[PDB]
Design a protein around this nucleic acid. Structure first.
Ligand code: XG4
Ligand code: MG
Ligand code: MG
Length: 429
DNA sequence: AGCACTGT
DNA sequence: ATCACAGTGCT
């Protein structure tokens, strides 16, 4: 804990998740360059998930499918289901629940996104350590594990699986010889458990995933990306100095945006490791007490954000953009789409209440007007008393109708480029 | 409470 | 003209 080695934390991330879901359903897509796309009409659809075969051609997320086909002519495409005029992600939310439920059998999980979850293995590691007590850890228990930073020094060596094994052997040889620390043993056992977790996910869903194992959430997530796909990486406390010495600051979670850019600009540094030069007080003065404290500890491999026990989303939301000439202008238009959104929301809320024994109590309504730089022009709350689509849509209209700045009966102005309904403030029931 | 930021 | 979500922190 003084060196931030009290916990064993893992981050599991499903490999090209939406693709895997579609590839499981359509075997003709397996082991092929493939992507998942929503809305075929505009340039073949926007790509939101890309198999690794397709990545090898340069296909990326946030790319029009027509442009993707220019890079990858044999690219196959699965379409997001469309329901009530909009993209419907239910299939991937259900697939995500399959996975989370398996992970819960092993430990406390924090659902971080639709396709990844943090795991706190600290207690499971102790449990496992007293079983087989004193018995050595065989390389056969870690068949897909990389040890970041290894192999090193002097004493297969040209291909990747050979590299992995050498690094693992070096790690395990130093373990059983007492040349490593107690937290290093714990991470190793954590990694044995994460192998079993990943094998169970694949056996029971067909989905492959990658994992990071380390002492905190940031290092776990960083480690998870070092060896994708279908592999897991152990980032020990001792590997942090070399790992961070050339790690771009933007690669650390929460520094990929404006804050990270201002750390680079204000301090004149490029890599996470350079942050160790500064005093905590110096970092607090530039970035605030909380950010400074977090940065001072994080650049040394230390962070204390806990794995929250939260397997379910906190909100259930429903949105649609209306770009360009499709922006909503008549009142009958806003009311029709508000109803479409409200109807999908009701279905999902009803399923939620039956599955998870809880009810939302607040309806958040957000819109965007044509010509606003910000992603949201107005957010407004109202009570959510019944799971009734028509009420929610009327209430959503009631709380935005004052945005219309026009006189004509059947006209809305300025036109709306975005509607968003969100149920929140869940309570047991 | 409304908003900005950050992430998948 | 990507888009559809979702969580956290500030004031
Ligand atoms: N609509 C939309 N969906 C997204 C976006 N980013 C991700 N998703 C959806 C699609 C993704 O399938 C899922 C998980 O996102 P990741 O873990 O960041 N990428 P993946 O799991 O696909 O591949 P790997 O993890 O091996 O890099 O969330 C986005 O910008 N937009
Ligand atoms: Mg993923
Ligand atoms: Mg992910």
């Amino acid at each position: 804990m003084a060196t931030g080695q009290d916990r064993v934390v893992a981050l599991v991330d499903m490999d090209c998740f939406f693709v895997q879901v579609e590839q499981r359903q359509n075997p003709h897509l397996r082991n092929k360059p493939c992507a998942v796309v929503q809305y075929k009409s505009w340039k073949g659809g926007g790509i939101i998930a890309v198999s690794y075969e397709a990545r090898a051609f340069g296909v990326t997320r946030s790319m029009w499918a027509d442009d993707a086909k220019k890079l990858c002519p044999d690219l196959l495409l699965a379409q997001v289901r469309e329901s009530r005029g909009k993209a419907n992600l239910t299939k991937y939310r259900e697939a995500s629940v399959e996975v989370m439920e398996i992970m819960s059998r092993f430990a406390v999980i924090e659902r971080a996104s639709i396709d990844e979850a943090y795991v706190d293995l600290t207690s499971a590691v102790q449990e496992r350590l007293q079983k087989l007590q004193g018995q050595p850890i065989s390389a056969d228990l870690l068949p897909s594990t990389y040890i970041e930073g290894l192999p090193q020094g002097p004493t297969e060596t040209v291909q990747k699986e050979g590299m992995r094994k050498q690094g693992l052997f070096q790690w395990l040889d130093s373990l059983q010889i007492d040349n490593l620390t107690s937290p290093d043993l714990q991470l190793t056992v954590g990694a044995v458990i994460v192998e079993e977790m990943r094998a169970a996910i694949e056996r029971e869903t067909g989905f492959q995933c990658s994992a990071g194992i380390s002492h905190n959430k940031v290092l776990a997530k960083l480690a998870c990306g070092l060896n994708k796909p279908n592999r897991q990486t152990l980032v020990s406390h001792g590997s942090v100095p070399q790992l961070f010495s050339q790690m771009p600051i933007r690669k650390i979670r929460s520094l990929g945006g404006k804050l990270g850019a201002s750390v680079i600009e204000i301090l004149g540094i490029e890599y996470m490791g350079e942050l160790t030069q500064f005093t905590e007080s110096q970092l607090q003065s530039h970035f605030g007490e909380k950010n400074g404290s977090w940065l001072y500890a994080m650049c040394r491999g230390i962070e204390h954000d806990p794995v929250k026990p939260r397997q379910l989303p906190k909100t259930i939301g429903c949105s649609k953009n209306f770009p360009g000439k499709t922006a909503l202008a008549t009142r009958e238009q806003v009311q029709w789409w508000l109803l479409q959104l409200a109807q999908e929301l009701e279905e999902r809320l009803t399923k939620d209440r039956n599955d998870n024994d809880r009810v939302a109590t607040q309806l958040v309504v957000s819109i965007r007007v044509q010509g606003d730089k910000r992603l949201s022009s107005l957010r407004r709350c109202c009570a959510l008393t019944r799971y009734d689509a028509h009420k929610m849509s009327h209430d959503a209209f009631t709380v935005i109708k004052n945005m219309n700045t026009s006189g004509i009966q059947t006209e809305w102005s300025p036109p709306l480029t975005m509607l968003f309904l969100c149920a929140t403030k869940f309570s047991a029931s």
